[PDB]
Design a protein around this ligand. Sequence first.
Ligand SMILES: Cc1cc2nc3c(=O)[nH]c(=O)nc-3n(C[C@H](O)[C@H](O)[C@H](O)COP(=O)(O)O)c2cc1C
Length: 364
Amino acid sequence: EKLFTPLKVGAVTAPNRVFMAPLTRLRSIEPGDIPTPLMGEYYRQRASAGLIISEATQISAQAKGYAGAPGLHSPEQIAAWKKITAGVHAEDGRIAVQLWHTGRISHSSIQPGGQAPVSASALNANTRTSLRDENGNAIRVDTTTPRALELDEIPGIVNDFRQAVANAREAGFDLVELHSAHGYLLHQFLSPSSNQRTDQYGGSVENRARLVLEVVDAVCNEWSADRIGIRVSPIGTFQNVDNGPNEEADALYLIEELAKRGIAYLHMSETDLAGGKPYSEAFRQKVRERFHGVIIGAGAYTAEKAEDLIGKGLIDAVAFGRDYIANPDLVARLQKKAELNPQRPESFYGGGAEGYTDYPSLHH
Ligand SMILES: Cc1cc2nc3c(=O)[nH]c(=O)nc-3n(C[C@H](O)[C@H](O)[C@H](O)COP(=O)(O)O)c2cc1C
């Protein structure tokens, strides 16, 4: 077993390789997109993780695409997150904040001014996002057609990432994870399917990767490269965003560029929940050749698959999603080969304590 051995992840040391994947749960307070004490309890319960990666969290109000997703842009949000990180640290845990801009996976009703959300191009996502009804319950609603960002608005987006990372540092997070996956704004620029721009932010892979690399450079300069992770989903299709006709080459280009910045980690979301073709060991080897920091894998991993690939030297850590929803002490359960609690997917999104903080540990 290597799963229960330590790993240096940039500025922090994880005591094990069992990480909590970023998991949107849509339980924040509105108005204000404010994290809550209940969210604090949930994260605290999971503090034995090698690393907790938070739910996706808005860099700005414009970034919002889901009712109930938290922000890290306002004073009230910063204060609330400070309490949550303090609780995780009281239990000797480590926590990263996942930072996103949802771009076109959003709805006008939750945007500033009730206006169309923004993206690389004016193309509808053709999916749904999660809003709230008049009683605060989660509902699924078709995405609004976005507006293409003007060239002159791009520096603002970079600055919003920079500022959110500054705020993350003040809020007591150990690391930040840039959400460059799953069809959200950074991925909308990366993908030729969602990016039809003719300026320097569209066309070639160098141009499509330009925004994400500008963000990486800004956040490394704001804090430190060893505080910065990035999540990518560069092989396959995610929320209708494919990775284009040269997905492997384009992925390896991006990864070679990221490596130059000396960032803490590369987190690869390998498939969506509906599944897809597995990563080849040859592709994994090509990623290792190009990236010199920690590599985290995710997507329907079992402990067995995680040990296999860590043992093979191809990845360093595994982020578990749904098993972490259901097992606050997943580390201990995996280490002892104990049964896991059953999952209740009906309470993944929205609601309250039920299906959130009521999954038990092995022992009380
Ligand atoms: C309810 C739920 C919410 C999710 N929210 C996020 C998110 O906020 N950010 C993200 O990058 N991935 C998100 N994902 C993907 C997970 O991080 C993770 O990659 C996936 O759940 C791993 O597969 P597993 O659940 O089979 O371990 C989410 C998944 C689920 C099931």
